[PDB]
């Protein structure tokens, strides 16, 4: 099929590409936690929301039982949904700024 249904909206993974720094400091990106990893595979089941601001590398997310993946460049703000089961495939140096948010902002 000529897919007009990408996995960014099929699975509710809202991605903002090329975010401006004023909105970043409005949310509180620099005042967040840290996470660093090289080439690994992290099976993770989400229990709450997560605003990931990737900093250094690249992360390819593969949902459970799927053969198509979604790629996030180093300048994206990704919001992983609740009850999400995926397998994050890392390839190179990776850094991020995350903040798990409950129901509401």
């Amino acid at each position: 099929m000529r897919t007009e249904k990408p996995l960014e909206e099929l699975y509710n993974v809202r991605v903002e590409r090329n975010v401006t720094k004023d909105r970043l400091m409005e949310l509180g990106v620099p005042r967040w936690s840290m996470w660093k990893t090289g080439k690994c595979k992290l099976p993770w089941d989400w229990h709450v929301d997560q605003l990931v601001y990737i900093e250094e590398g690249e992360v390819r997310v593969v949902p459970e039982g799927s053969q198509r993946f979604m790629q996030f460049v180093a300048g994206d703000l990704v919001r992983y949904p609740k009850w999400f089961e995926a397998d994050l495939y890392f390839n190179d140096f990776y850094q991020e700024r995350y903040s798990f948010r409950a129901y509401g902002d």
């Binding site: 909206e9 509710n12 949904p81 609740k82």
Partner: protein, 218 residues
């Protein structure tokens, strides 16, 4: 850019319910609280074009997202909710239901007095803001009284609503400061619309059949 961009003025005038709900209060609820909701829904629909081309009943279900609501679910739900409410009330008053609705209430809730008692109990038992609904369940084919959260409407469970009340405080604070049971009693005695509920049940009968088939003798 904007769809559903209209306050959808109520059937009656703003001073039609003056002996029970002052013309100022209505003006505020409709003029300010509701209008605002629409404006924000239009601003959110301008950004996302995929959710722009969807009907209201489908937009609510697609923004509910099965427990994890999208950031525009609350607003659209409110707009729909409010619309239902204005129309769920009629000028004059509501004494008793009519041919079909009264029979269905007697079949489901036993009697109309028991129905009113359960409705008042569910209205007073709610905590915080929210709405109370008189819905028709599809798979069960019966009328039920469900209480919901701040903005959630029974459309998320595929249930046809017939009557609704706004238990959010904005509705009652001006004329009935803290006597919410009074507000309920007034809404049930001189502000409930049974003709509108009967018309909505007639419309719903095209989606849920309330009757028995004609079985041939063979």
């Amino acid at each position: 850019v904007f769809a559903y961009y209209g306050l959808k003025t109520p059937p009656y005038k703003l001073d039609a319910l003056e002996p029970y709900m002052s013309q100022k209060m209505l003006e505020v609820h409709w003029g300010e609280h509701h209008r605002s909701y629409v404006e924000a829904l239009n601003k959110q629909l301008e950004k996302n074009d995929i959710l722009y081309g969807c009907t209201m009943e489908e937009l609510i279900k697609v923004t509910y997202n099965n427990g994890n609501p999208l950031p525009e679910f609350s607003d659209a739900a409110q707009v729909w909710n409010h619309d239902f409410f204005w129309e769920s009330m009629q000028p004059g008053g509501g004494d008793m239901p009519k041919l079909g609705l009264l029979q269905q209430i007697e079949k489901d809730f036993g009697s109309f007095t028991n129905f009113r008692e359960k409705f008042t109990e569910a209205a007073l038992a709610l905590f915080g803001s929210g709405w109370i609904w008189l819905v028709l369940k599809r798979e069960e084919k019966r009328l039920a009284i469900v209480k919901t959260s701040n903005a959630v409407n029974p459309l998320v469970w595929n249930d046809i609503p017939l009557i609704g009340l706004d238990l959010w405080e904005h509705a009652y604070y001006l004329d009935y400061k803290n006597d919410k049971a009074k507000y309920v009693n007034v809404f049930m005695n001189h502000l409930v619309s049974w003709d509108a509920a009967l018309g909505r049940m007639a419309r719903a009968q095209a989606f849920v059949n309330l009757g028995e088939p004609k079985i041939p003798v063979a």
